[PDB]
Write a structure and sequence with these properties.
The PDB classes it as gene regulation. With 121 residues, this protein is mainly alpha-helical. The chain has five helices and no strands.
């Protein structure tokens, strides 16, 4: 149908905007701490601690399959990255501290994203 196409164009355009959002958030992680999945070879107990692992590469795979229906879904995955880190790692660690800085800096990007998503519809 023509309606299904229009819906698909909307999804494609959301994917475009979320790709730019993802790039801007990942720039706030210049150490690449959150770039890839925590390695279960190197942290064998990880899934005993963290039930839903997340990282920027995993988000990018979902994004490119147009697997984010709305900004809320995308933010859920970004918050997982941060929240998983802040539980597994202690306050006095470079990992925890990286997550705090990512959260604080990402907030600004996500605030305007929400306005753009609502504005453009």
């Amino acid at each position: 149908s023509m309606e299904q196409v229009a819906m698909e164009l909307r999804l494609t355009e959301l994917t475009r905007l979320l790709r730019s959002v993802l790039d801007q958030l990942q720039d706030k992680d210049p150490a690449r701490i959150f770039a890839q999945p925590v390695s279960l070879k190197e942290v064998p107990d990880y899934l005993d601690h963290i039930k839903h692992p997340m990282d920027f590469a995993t988000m990018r795979k979902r994004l490119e399959a147009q697997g984010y229906k709305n900004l809320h879904e995308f933010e859920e995955d970004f918050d997982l990255i941060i929240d998983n880190c802040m539980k597994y790692n202690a306050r006095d660690t470079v990992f925890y501290r990286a997550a705090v800085r990512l959260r604080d800096q990402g907030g600004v990007v996500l605030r305007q994203a929400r306005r753009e998503v609502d504005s453009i519809g």
